[PDB]
């Protein structure tokens, strides 16, 4: 507990006066240099380095630097979060999780709705997106989903969103992820997911390219959110029905083999039981046929031929589409297919 | 169908990989899939047995059941009924075992998230990643980095006692990696430097906590480096004067306390012989005690140097430290005693002469006087100045009670001898501290554990639960009453807490029953036996009618046996036994069995050590005469013993249950002794009573009934369990109204259709229960003229329950219209008919206070059963 009073001053002065040589090595040892003194603990580099803050590297000494703050540097936390909310655009994908980090452990327990709402405001500088931007802010809201209050938090302020919607690529993958992970975050997620396509602003191009040219963020989502809600969202108000076959027409493109497995099988279910999905269900596997053809058959050897075991429940015209699916797949491999139909 | 089955649930693991399934594919399957689940988990035949059979026989083909029904099932299966939470429990922890990387780090974030929010779950979690981290330590790191290390940044929200097994979590994770891991702790609490130093009211405790964690897991160069500079800032705390010196020896001395066998003496003698060698010379370098210097506050200069007299010297003898006293007793007591007697224990190892190394505290106890702490005749607060200065006595007293308890016969009578004058000074201390206007909080309710009160005087109670200490002094006379008294209170207020504190709650609560329930059953089974006999004596019943000289005796030697029983409830009565590993259940009934009756059923096989034990049980509850305030758990403890009501015995117990609400050791010698403990000792007795009685349940509610009529003639005979001139405030009758809506509900299969006379002679048994119905309405009214303040209220709920099983029932009114025989369904069907409405308007006129609003309100609702009454009418 050494009372070295003048030397973070000193230092501080001799740091800011010489070349940018020892700039990083002067910087980073300021947070046990200023650590002499418990009320120069948080108060002294409270303003010495707040506006000193210009480039990146002195991001880690005010985090542990306002080891007190009396809950108001925190909002000064929020307030320097917002200084760097400019700098996001001109970091330039060097330290942006480390950046995004800062920003999202000030808001911790208290109300954080505008919180996010700065953070996707400033993720218009920065993520259309960026090619390593997607995994470079979930790098920070993956990371945050344990809190489980910035989780309901992004819920509710994912709504008021009408200007980054339709780019809102990365904030489209923070609905599967709240989804997958928080239980009884799942109905309400389904809701503002739903209420988003519908009114316009979510189309099927958003789920394209969310689906194609970033896939591996939203891979580990799959086996809940995308297929739990692709049934679920094959319901009602045909503008929703045509994003939900988008889903799992996607989902079949660029996903593993265990999930092109299970979305046939959740097709063939469907069209095993159902009223008016039948047809959604039917023209589906009919545009994965057309397709995505030689890589529909190894996922078909049991799975497109169970529903002539039930052709007896209902096909007027789908019966017509249905052997059109079994013939184009019999046709399309000479090795197997037309043996089997 | 997978419902339905009961012989091939233990053997259909097929059972629960389709249950999966189903759970996993069938979306609205889902919901109905964790009832079967659950409903399968509880009432046996899923054990966690069956679960490591899935996982670890058959984990390639669940590996596809995941994310949907295994972590959200395991997740899901966190709420209540212990059966399932250790199912629950074994899933997320067989899921990290056998799966993929993926896997892993999603049940750790399930875990992470799981602690970052949760009330009851903390618990669970906390136990569980600890088994993870014992278990799986190489393969928990690696999904640890920024997973387990986040919690930290939570710590704030719920951690009493879960603090100290997250820092063992993040310690024993720091400690298994020599490549990366020990820098990432040591940082963690560096950060806690600043912390450490000031960085809110808290941080500084959980800066030394989880310094003092990370500095043992160094006990099992660089590392001594990086240590002893952030130990420098410990040390820096410690000099600065609190407290927190004394919750950095109480770290210390929990550290030497939980790992024994490890931790060799040259590094903890490194770590402290600083720490352990400033209590013998705080102030105690004097040669004649027997002056008082000034001993600043001298209310004891005039009598100094109180009774132990088993020492050669007297230097200052605990006296001088405590002059001035103001101390958090790290200064020559309690906290530092803590670690004296440890590092003692553990350097000069063995510990077997190393007890008598310390043969008094620095080999000194005290002298031959009364008193000999001085903090007092100056401080003017009639509190503050001994009721602070005993807690540090009573403190000392019991340090050195759970600190001495070795075989030394010389030794182990002056502990003997310490815990009796621990209970005298315990005495005169309560004593004070009630002539004191409030308390002494801060050496009472605030210090001795940060850093009967029973908070904070937290080692003076034996370490307010150190089973070690019952271990010796209840297996001591295998002698005190009033010691048998505080340490039985010591044992249930322990038993509590840990086999449904931070001293106790290091140990597993298995453990605890291992080193309570099995290696203490016959020292407290001997004194249950000797108490037994001073009650076929006047020894608890002298002081009510004949041995009136010991008065104040007869209360504590029934405090001690309610206590015993209780203890025999709470190391049964509980989850800490019985499951599934019930190998222990054979080792601590066995002991029971063979206790007083024939140990030659020693290898008696399983369901007749129980069947056995409680013959001796039942044959000891015909003496249980401590006014019954025990008997509520002497019945709480024998139905605990046994499975289920299933037992020919059974029908024993029950008709001794009736013999003591009959009796309640005899009709309760106390006036006033009914109040409030029996308030809800006999309405969960008469629930034992009338939850079985020769299997009649409605000749005996209509035997209360009828016994309701003699209690308002001359208010009390055949029956004492409701016989208070004021009926026990009726709660037999809340009790009996709840056992009748219980029965007409339970009466459904009685009603098999219409088919002949087997369907109509539910008839009978549904007007028998319209009769009853009508015995207790119309005492109902009798008894509400006497006084119906809650009576009302509990009337008006059971009116709405039975008028509710008569409309459920009223489908063998209408269907056994014909079967009611209608050259005589006149009178079948309008004894209830005419009953329900006699009732309904006898139902009124008591819950009306509202303005004049519901003096037909209840006849608003009887118009509901008066419609369904002439629909029957009409029916029949």
Same mark, same amino acid.
């Given at each position: 507990?050494?009372?070295l009073?003048d030397?973070?001053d000193?230092?501080? %002065?001799?740091?800011?006066? !010489? ?7 002067q910087?980073d @040892? ?23 803050? %210009?480039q990146?590297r ?6 542990l630097?306002a ?5 108001l ?11 760097? &909310? ?7 994908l ?5 950046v ?10 208290a109300?954080?709705?505008e919180?996010?709402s700065?953070?996707?405001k ?13 995994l470079?802010?979930?790098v920070?809201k ?22 980054v919607?339709?780019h809102?690529?990365l ?9 997958s992970?928080?239980? %009884? ?16 602003? #979510?189309?099927?191009?958003l ?16 086996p ?7 049934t679920?969202?094959?319901?009602a108000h ?12 996607q989902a ?5 083999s ?6 046939v099988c959740a097709?063939v ?10 047809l ?7 545009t994965?046929?057309v397709?995505?053809?030689p ?7 049991t799975?497109?031929?169970?529903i ?16 059109y699916?079994?013939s ?14 | 169908? *997978? ?6 649930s233990?053997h259909k693991?097929?059972?629960?990989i389709?249950?999966l ?23 046996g ?9 899935a996982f670890?026989?058959?984990?390639m083909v669940? %590996?596809d ?34 799966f993929?990387?993926?896997?892993q ?15 009851e779950?903390e618990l669970?979690?906390s136990?569980?990643?600890?088994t993870?981290?014992v ?8 999904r640890?980095?920024?997973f387990?290390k986040?919690?930290?940044?939570? #710590?704030?929200?719920?951690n009493?006692?879960?603090?100290r ?6 310690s024993?994770?720091?400690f298994s ?26 941080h ?14 160094v006990?099992?160069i660089?590392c001594?480096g ?23 020896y ?5 550290? @030497? ?23 013998p010379?705080?102030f105690v370098?004097?040669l004649?005690?027997t002056?008082d ?21 007297i230097?200052?003898?605990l006296?001088?430290?405590v002059?001035?006293?103001r101390?958090?007793?790290?200064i ?10 440890? /590092? ?8 077997l ?8 505290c ?39 009670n ?5 075989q ?7 502990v003997?001898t310490?815990?009796?004058? *621990?209970?005298e000074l315990q005495?005169v201390?309560?004593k004070?501290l009630?002539?004191?206007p ?16 029973l908070?904070? /005087?937290?080692?003076?109670?034996r ?7 019952s271990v010796l002094?209840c297996?001591l006379?295998?002698?005190g009453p009033?010691?048998? +008294?505080?340490?039985?209170?010591d044992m ?25 329930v ?5 020292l +407290? ?13 006047i020894?608890?019943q ?5 041995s009136?000289?010991n ?9 001690c046996?309610?206590?015993l !029983? !209780?203890?025999?409830?709470?190391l049964?009565?509980?989850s ?6 019930n190998?222990?259940?054979?080792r ?16 008696f ?8 034990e ?23 403890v024998? &139905?605990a013993?046994?499975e ?10 029950m008709?001794?249950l009736a ?7 005899w &009709? ?10 029996h ?10 009573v /009338? ?7 409605l ?11 003699? =209690? ?8 004492c369990?409701?016989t208070?001139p004021t009926?026990?405030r ?15 509900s ?15 002679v539910q008839?009978?048994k ?8 009508r015995?207790?309405?119309?005492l109902?009214?009798?008894?509400k ?25 009223? #489908? ?8 009611k025989?209608?050259?005589d369904?006149?009178?079948?069907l309008k004894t ?11 139902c009124g006129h008591?819950? @009306? ?8 309100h ?7 059963? =008066?419609?369904?009454? /002439? ?6």
């Amino acid at each position: 507990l050494d009372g070295l009073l003048d030397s973070q001053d000193l230092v501080k %002065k001799l740091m800011q006066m !010489l070349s940018v040589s020892p700039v990083p090595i002067q910087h980073d @040892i300021i947070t046990s240099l200023p650590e002499i003194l418990e009320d120069s603990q948080q108060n002294e580099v409270a303003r010495e380095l707040s506006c000193l803050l %210009k480039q990146g590297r002195r991001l880690t000494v005010p985090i542990l630097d306002a080891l007190s703050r009396l809950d108001l540097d925190a909002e000064l936390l929020a307030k320097v979060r917002q200084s760097a &909310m400019t700098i996001v655009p001109s970091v330039k994908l060097e330290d942006l999780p480390v950046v995004i980090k800062f920003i999202l452990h000030n808001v911790k327990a208290a109300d954080a709705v505008e919180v996010i709402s700065d953070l996707r405001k400033s993720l218009d500088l920065s993520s259309t997106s960026q090619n390593c931007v997607k995994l470079l802010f979930d790098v920070i809201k993956l990371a945050v989903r344990f809190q489980k209050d910035v989780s309901e938090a992004w819920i509710k302020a994912i709504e008021n969103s009408t200007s980054v919607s339709d780019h809102k690529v990365l904030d489209l993958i923070v609905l599967l992820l709240i989804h997958s992970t928080n239980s %009884k975050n799942r109905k309400q997620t389904e809701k503002v997911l739903r209420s988003k396509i519908r009114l316009g602003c #979510m189309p099927e191009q958003l789920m394209q390219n969310a689906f194609q040219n970033h896939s591996m963020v939203i891979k580990d989502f799959f086996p809940s959110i995308l297929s739990l809600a692709q049934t679920f969202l094959h319901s009602a108000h045909p503008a929703v029905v045509s994003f939900g076959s988008c889903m799992y027409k996607q989902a079949f493109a660029v996903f593993d083999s265990y999930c092109q497995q299970e979305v046939v099988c959740a097709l063939v279910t469907h069209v095993c039981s159902g009223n008016e999905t039948e047809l959604d269900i039917s023209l589906d596997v009919l545009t994965d046929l057309v397709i995505l053809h030689p890589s529909l058959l190894l996922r078909y050897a049991t799975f497109v031929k169970t529903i002539l075991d039930s052709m007896q429940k209902l096909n007027p015209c789908q019966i017509r589409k249905l052997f059109y699916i079994l013939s184009t797949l019999a046709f399309s491999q000479r090795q197997e297919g037309s043996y089997i139909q | 169908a *997978i419902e339905n089955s009961t012989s091939v649930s233990d053997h259909k693991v097929l059972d629960l990989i389709v249950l999966l399934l189903i759970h996993s594919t069938n979306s609205k399957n889902r919901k109905q899939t964790e009832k079967v689940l659950r409903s399968k988990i509880r009432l046996g035949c899923m054990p966690e047995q069956l679960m490591q059979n899935a996982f670890q026989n058959h984990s390639m083909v669940i %590996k596809d059941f995941f994310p949907s029904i295994l972590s959200l099932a395991q997740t899901f299966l966190h709420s209540a009924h212990p059966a399932v939470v250790s199912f629950g429990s074994c899933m997320y922890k067989q899921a990290f075992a056998v799966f993929d990387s993926y896997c892993q780090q999603e049940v750790v974030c399930a875990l992470v998230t799981h602690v970052c929010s949760g009330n009851e779950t903390e618990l669970d979690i906390s136990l569980d990643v600890l088994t993870d981290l014992v278990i799986l330590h190489p393969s928990l790191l690696l999904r640890y980095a920024t997973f387990v290390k986040t919690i930290l940044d939570s #710590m704030q929200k719920l951690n009493p006692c879960q603090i100290r097994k997250l820092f063992y979590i993040l310690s024993t994770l720091a400690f298994s990696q020599r490549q990366e891991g020990s820098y990432i702790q040591d940082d963690m609490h560096m950060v806690i430097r600043k912390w450490l130093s000031s960085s809110v009211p808290n941080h500084k405790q959980m800066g030394i906590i989880g310094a003092v964690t990370m500095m043992g897991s160094v006990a099992l160069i660089e590392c001594d480096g990086q240590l002893s500079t952030l130990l420098d800032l410990v040390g820096f705390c410690c000099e600065q004067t609190p407290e927190v010196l004394a919750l950095y020896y109480d770290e210390l001395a929990n550290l @030497i306390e939980k790992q024994k066998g490890n931790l060799d003496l040259q590094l903890l003698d490194k770590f402290g012989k600083s720490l352990v060698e400033d209590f013998p010379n705080d102030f105690v370098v004097d040669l004649s005690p027997t002056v008082d210097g000034s001993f600043l506050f001298p209310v004891k200069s005039l009598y100094n140097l109180d009774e132990d007299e088993t020492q050669g010297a007297i230097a200052i003898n605990l006296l001088p430290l405590v002059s001035q006293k103001r101390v958090v007793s790290p200064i020559c007591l309690s906290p530092c005693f803590r670690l004296l007697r440890l /590092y003692t224990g553990e350097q000069n190892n063995g510990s077997l002469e190393e007890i008598d190394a310390l043969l008094g505290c620095p080999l000194y106890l005290t002298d031959l006087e009364v008193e000999g702490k001085l903090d007092s005749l100056s401080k003017q607060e009639r509190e503050f100045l001994c009721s602070l200065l005993f807690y540090a006595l009573n403190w000392f007293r019991e340090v050195v009670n759970a600190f001495c308890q070795q075989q030394d016969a010389e030794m182990k009578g002056k502990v003997l001898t310490r815990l009796q004058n *621990i209970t005298e000074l315990q005495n005169v201390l309560g004593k004070c501290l009630a002539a004191t206007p409030g308390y002494v909080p801060p050496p009472a309710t605030f210090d001795s554990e940060a850093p009967a009160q029973l908070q904070s /005087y937290r080692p003076y109670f034996r370490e307010l639960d150190l089973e070690v200490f019952s271990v010796l002094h209840c297996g001591l006379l295998t002698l005190g009453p009033a010691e048998l +008294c505080f340490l039985l209170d010591d044992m249930c207020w322990k038993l509590e807490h840990v086999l449904t504190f931070s001293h106790l709650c290091q140990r597993s609560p298995k453990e605890v029953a291992v080193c309570v329930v099995k290696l203490l059953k016959p020292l +407290c089974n001997h004194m249950e036996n000797m108490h037994n006999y001073f009650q076929t004596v006047i020894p608890n019943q002298g002081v009510v009618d004949e041995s009136g000289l010991n008065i104040q005796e007869y209360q504590l030697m029934s405090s001690c046996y309610h206590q015993l !029983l !209780l203890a025999f409830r709470l190391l049964f009565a509980w989850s800490g036994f019985s499951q599934h590993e019930n190998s222990n259940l054979l080792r601590s009934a066995l002991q029971v069995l063979a206790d007083r009756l024939k140990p030659g059923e020693t290898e008696f096989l399983p369901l007749e050590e129980l069947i056995s034990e409680s013959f001796q049980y039942l044959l000891n509850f015909q003496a249980s005469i401590p006014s019954f305030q025990c008997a509520f758990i002497l019945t709480q403890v024998l &139905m605990a013993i046994s499975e289920k009501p299933m037992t020919g015995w059974k029908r024993e117990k029950m008709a001794s249950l009736a013999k003591q609400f009959l009796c309640q050791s005899w &009709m309760k010698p106390g006036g006033d002794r009914e109040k409030g403990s029996h308030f809800n000792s006999a309405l969960h007795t008469l629930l034992c009573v /009338y939850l079985e009685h020769t299997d009649n349940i409605l000749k005996a509610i209509e035997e209360i009934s009828s016994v309701g009529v003699p =209690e308002l003639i001359n208010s009390a005979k055949d029956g004492c369990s409701s016989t208070y001139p004021t009926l026990s405030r009726q709660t037999f009758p809340v009790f009996f109204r709840v056992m009748m809506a219980q029965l007409e509900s339970s009466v459904k299969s009685i009603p098999a259709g219409k088919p002949s006379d087997s369907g109509e002679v539910q008839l009978e048994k549904l007007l028998k229960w319209n009769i009853a119905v009508r015995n207790f309405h119309i005492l109902i009214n009798l008894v509400k003229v006497f006084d119906s303040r809650p009576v009302l209220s509990i009337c008006l709920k059971y009116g709405r329950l039975f008028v509710e099983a008569f409309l459920k029932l009223a #489908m063998p009114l209408l269907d056994h219209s014909f079967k009611k025989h209608r050259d005589d369904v006149q009178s079948l069907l309008k004894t209830l008919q005419l009953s329900t409405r006699q009732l309904h308007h006898m139902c009124g006129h008591s819950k @009306i206070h509202q303005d004049l609003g519901l003096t037909n309100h209840v006849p608003l609702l009887k118009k509901s059963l =008066e419609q369904f009454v /002439y629909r029957v009418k009409a029916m029949l």
